[PDB]
């Protein structure tokens, strides 16, 4: 449950450190 909420919240500001985007 906490994992689900964490994924939901982090999706708002998630940025990948790999360039270019796959």
């Amino acid at each position, epitope marked *: 449950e906490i994992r689900d909420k964490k994924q939901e*919240v*982090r999706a708002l*500001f*998630y*940025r990948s450190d790999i*360039v270019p985007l796959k």
Partner: antibody
Amino acid sequence: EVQLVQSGAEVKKPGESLKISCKGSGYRFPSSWIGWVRQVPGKGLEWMGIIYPGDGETRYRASFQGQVTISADQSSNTAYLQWSSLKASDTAMYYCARHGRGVREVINAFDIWGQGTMVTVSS
Amino acid sequence: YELTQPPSVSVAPGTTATITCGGVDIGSTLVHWYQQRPGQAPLLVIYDDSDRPSGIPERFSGSNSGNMATLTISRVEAGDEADYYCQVWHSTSAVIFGGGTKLTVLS
């Protein structure tokens, strides 16, 4: 250690432009958001905007859109908050803060703060 | 969206200090708590509701559910006197801080 060092206090007049800076050291600058927060002395914290230095994505609080611009320098690891035309109501302390990029390996919060830059606007 | 905090809270030393953060469905997001002493920059004391950063003593704890989140300081000490702010990332472009709470440890 990881730290953010901000530029010195400023005294400016209404209508003038201003650029304050936030130098990051001890960590990989491109992989963390940098947010700017305003605090009028004696008052609470107000979020202004945030930039991801890895590519320059910026997000702003609606009320601050059009008044300030946030930018970043990937060679000097420096974030910037910039006013084109200052107002008297811009007098405040301004903090920069590092925020994780949304992965479990980092803290997804403002875990490192700068010491603050005091800006006074008076004619 | 608004986060509601009590403007001031006073507690006897050694007792449990409780600071609440009021938001609609705030239990469906993650709440973070920052400490600020006069003249100093904020300091992260709790993140992801119940997680402590390194260097923060274990007496600090947090919870979050329904329409309220809570910062709890057990065996509160004089050194904990300070302002406390809750914070959430509500939407893409919305990052919100609570109004802040001045915690006084009655001396």
